[PDB]
Amino acid sequence: SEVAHRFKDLGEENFKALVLIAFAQYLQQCPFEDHVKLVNEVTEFAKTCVADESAENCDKSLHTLFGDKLCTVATLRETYGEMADCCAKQEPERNECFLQHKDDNPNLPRLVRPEVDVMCTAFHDNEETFLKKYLYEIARRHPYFYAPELLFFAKRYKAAFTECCQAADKAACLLPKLDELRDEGKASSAKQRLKCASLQKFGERAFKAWAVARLSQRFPKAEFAEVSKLVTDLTKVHTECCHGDLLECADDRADLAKYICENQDSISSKLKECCEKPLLEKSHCIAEVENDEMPADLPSLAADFVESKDVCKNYAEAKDVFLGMFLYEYARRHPDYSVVLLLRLAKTYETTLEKCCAAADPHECYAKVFDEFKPLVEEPQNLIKQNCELFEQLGEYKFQNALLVRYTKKVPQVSTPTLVEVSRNLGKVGSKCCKHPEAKRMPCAEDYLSVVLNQLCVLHEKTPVSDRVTKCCTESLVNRRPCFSALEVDETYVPKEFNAETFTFHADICTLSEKERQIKKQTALVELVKHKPKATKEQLKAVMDDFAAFVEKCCKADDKETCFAEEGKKLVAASQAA
Ligand SMILES: CC(=O)Nc1nc(C)c(-c2cnc(F)c(NS(=O)(=O)c3sc(C)nc3C)c2)s1
């Protein structure tokens, strides 16, 4: 019995919560009530298997069980659409099918926190139903959310309301704390979507090379064997989470934290505070703790990998082992390099070792390897440096605007809302990284730009409209950022004609908050670029501020919502003819 095994290992609480997530990630449109009932029935069924493990259905797989249950609500499909297709199959084809229909951009109401008092009301009226609400609503919008990690956000959510609902100022305690988990959640989500896109699109080998490079950077005093044991455990975990095997994912993550903490002196000296923490806090802490000190007496890389005469020899004996070794060795020496740069280095290392060990003289040609590594290292360096000056010059909002212009011209066929969600997230790179010294930027900046770009890939993949996004997204996971960066103004694209709809907005704008008031201005800024990409110097910004003045001036003109309609049809024609 699988469900009884997981039940025992995870505890009732976590079993419930993890099962709710799985369902919300597979049936995103389905009502909250339906999912909660279904979960209760599964839990009810689980308890019986824990009692007598030979009870009728207790030897079926978790997907068999969980899919049969989901399917009691899915297999009708007027509003559900195409998810009764998956219910006409048997496992393991059904799970493939559910997975395949995960929606990165579900048409769901874009989510708005009600007042603090009403929330404390519900939190105290029934605290269970309130917290299940948070899981359901985050999970169904983030169907790849790292499920063990979603339980931690859930615990911190609960503690916020526990502390703040007993405050003299419920709002001041709770606004900052809920603002934190919101931002932290989105970031958490975007990262996890990259881990799954790698496993799902590029295959486990590609993911193995990622964690080898990351854990080596983080645990550089650890031996290779050790680093490898960890990469193997960590790969499995994420494979299971990304393939909807969430109970086993959570169980294995806990095992891995437990092992890590029981082999600390073999891994790192920065693990003290993490391993003294309640179990969800623990895995979170481990997953993202500061890199350890780099050992003193490391010999030059070049000796084992370039100067040595046994390279082609040793390479051949075990290529994947030798290449991981290289990656291990190059990474632990460079916590100042982005992960994707380390992976670019190891690919170049690989293809050089491939042609040189065939040709006339191995020793001679592969000795040059390090000059092939040169340009690859400096291209990110100059970019992160160049884009951080710009940020300090312009500040965040204008830094976002600049990249919007940049990216719109890059890939003008892309949906305007997407460009807007992507360019803003790209622009967040400045406040996040530039802060740091130059020896900590590149990983901060480039691996984050990898994540945001991945977001552009998945949103576009839904309905492809741009050949260049497809190419840049399908080619090499690791070379995506150089790819997009390399793109210039698209000349094939023929501009969009304006019309009496794309801009003529209403009076609700004034009551909107700073942020939404920015996004609308940014949405219009994209359309101005789509409609005339070329001549777009300061003539863009001279019109964008004429929208800004227009909005502000017309907002505060005591008008019965009429100045907008009147003075709005004007400036579209005016900003066109300009
Ligand atoms: C129609 C409707 O009522 N939808 C909503 N359902 C839930 C559970 C909402 C919600 C409840 N409590 C919060 F506290 C936040 N906080 S938040 O919006 O800022 C957060 S927190 C987080 C991890 N993501 C977001 C978007 C959001 S709003």
From Swiss-Prot:
InterPro entries linked to this entry: ALB/AFP/VDB, Serum_albumin-like, Serum_albumin/AFP/Afamin, Serum_albumin_CS, Serum_albumin_N
Does the entry annotate any disulfide bonds, and if so which pairs? C49-C58, C71-C87, C86-C97, C120-C165, C164-C173, C196-C242, C241-C249, C261-C275, C274-C285, C312-C357, C356-C365, C388-C434, C433-C444, C457-C473, C472-C483, C510-C555, C554-C563
One GO BP: cellular response to calcium ion starvation
Q: Which residues bind Ca(2+) 2?
A: D9, D251, D255
Q: Which residues bind (4Z,15Z)-bilirubin IXalpha?
A: K236
Q: Which residues are glycosylated?
A: 8, 47, 133, 158, 195, 221, 229, 272, 277, 309, 313-314, 319, 347, 374, 409, 435, 440, 490, 521, 530, 532, 541, 569
| CDD domains tied to this protein | ALBUMIN (cd00015)
Residues annotated to bind Ca(2+) 1: E2, E240, D245, E248
Query: Where would you say this protein principally sits, based on its record?
Result: secreted
Q: Where in the cell is it found?
A: Secreted
Residues bearing PTM Phosphoserine: S1, S54, S61, S269, S415, S485
Q: Which PROSITE patterns match?
A: ALBUMIN_1 (PS00212), ALBUMIN_2 (PS51438)
Quaternary organization: Interacts with FCGRT; this interaction regulates ALB homeostasis. Interacts with TASOR. In plasma, occurs in a covalently-linked complex with chromophore-bound alpha-1-microglobulin with molar ratio 1:2 and 1:1; this interaction does not prevent fatty acid binding to ALB.
Q: Which PANTHER family match?
A: ALBUMIN, SERUM ALBUMIN-RELATED
Name of the protein in its database record: Albumin
Annotated organism of origin: Homo sapiens
